[PDB]
């Protein structure tokens, strides 16, 4: 069919990146809101774009959680990567969490400031990378607007979940997580 120069065929392959789960986190998209970060073959995080709150506490006692050390480390590492990667984050009151019970629950308020200097834009930009591979349908922004992105959701919610084949729109891929490893200390304001 697609025979180039009369002697070569154009052929394809697709890689089954799910087999990389044993050594690296994989991101995957369901519907146009849920995103999952899969860890090993047992757990992971669920990233949900929602119009409902989960935390009205407005505190995030990371140091209490650290002293107790009851949380899964792989999952906390992922949360840290996500959080630290948010550029120009200084609106600490926009973030709250409930790291008690040995569980992970993190809430980012995208309506705290609602232009482009808002923490919401910074949070959505990290989201785009962490869930790269369907994050664009969930964002529901046109292309060429990354610099100033806003969405239809009030909160970005991250909570620990269990393993399931949590995929509809995209295929599991390590790229989002891996890409963020170089951005961990970028776009940080003085204290």
């Amino acid at each position, epitope marked *: 069919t697609s025979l180039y120069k009369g002697v070569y065929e154009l052929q394809t392959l697709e890689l089954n990146m799910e087999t990389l789960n044993m050594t690296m986190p994989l991101s995957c998209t369901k519907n146009n809101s849920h995103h999952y970060i899969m860890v090993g073959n047992e757990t992971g995080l669920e990233l949900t774009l929602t*119009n*409902t709150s*989960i*935390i*009205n506490h407005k505190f995030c006692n990371l140091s209490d959680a650290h002293k107790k050390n009851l949380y899964d480390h792989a999952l906390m590492s992922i949360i840290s990567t996500f959080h630290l990667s948010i550029p120009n984050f200084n609106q600490y009151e926009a973030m709250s969490c*409930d790291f008690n019970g040995g569980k992970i*629950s993190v809430q980012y308020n995208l*309506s705290h400031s609602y232009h482009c200097g808002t923490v919401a834009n910074g949070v959505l930009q990290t989201f785009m990378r962490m869930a790269w591979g369907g994050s664009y349908i969930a964002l529901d922004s046109g292309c060429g607007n990354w610099d100033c992105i806003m969405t239809s959701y*009030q909160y970005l919610i991250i*909570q620990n979940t269990t393993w399931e084949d949590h995929c509809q729109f995209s295929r599991p891929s390590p790229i989002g997580y891996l890409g963020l490893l170089s951005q961990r200390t970028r776009d940080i304001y003085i204290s």
Partner: antibody
Amino acid sequence: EVQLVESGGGLVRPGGSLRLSCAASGFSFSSYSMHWVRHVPGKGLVWVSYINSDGSTKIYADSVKGRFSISRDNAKNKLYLQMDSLRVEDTAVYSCVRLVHYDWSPFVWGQGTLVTVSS
Amino acid sequence: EIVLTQSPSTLSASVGDRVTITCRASQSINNWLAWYQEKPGKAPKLLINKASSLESGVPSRFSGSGSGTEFTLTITSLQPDDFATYYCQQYNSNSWTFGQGTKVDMK
């Protein structure tokens, strides 16, 4: 996902008692206040009671006083409503409602359960 | 201590017709009015909240207004599936008040 699940319904003889409970799951329940609402199919929907997230405020509908006791178990994330001296007019489907003002999806409803008072 | 009144208590309509109902508050409820659609045999469905914010899964033909004491719910073109008793609810007290409801009948 944010969810409220009621249980403990059933048949009560007039003047008897029934304890309802409601399991909260997927959110930081102990930080939120809660309401009980009941539905009588031939009437409109009506409010029953309200409890503050720390339990310091407990209020009831004027039509129901001295019969209901509202409480919360923050450790277990369970909302309770203890009803006594149940009257025939208290027959309704009871359900949990999590109302948050300024939330973009302000009302989280459970499924409810039927409490029937009859002879 | 807030008492809501709906009106007209009954109204009839043709299918596809434009109908409106109202709700009148006593004290102010700001824009914290909610509306419900009650079908026989079913729990009421929340349609609108925050006076005019349409709830998820609710058809675009539904709307509403008000931010003080005068409120409304409207249907741009009534469907066979919209013949229901409609109720208004205020939630500016932590002691919710529901109106008596209005019923849309077919003529």
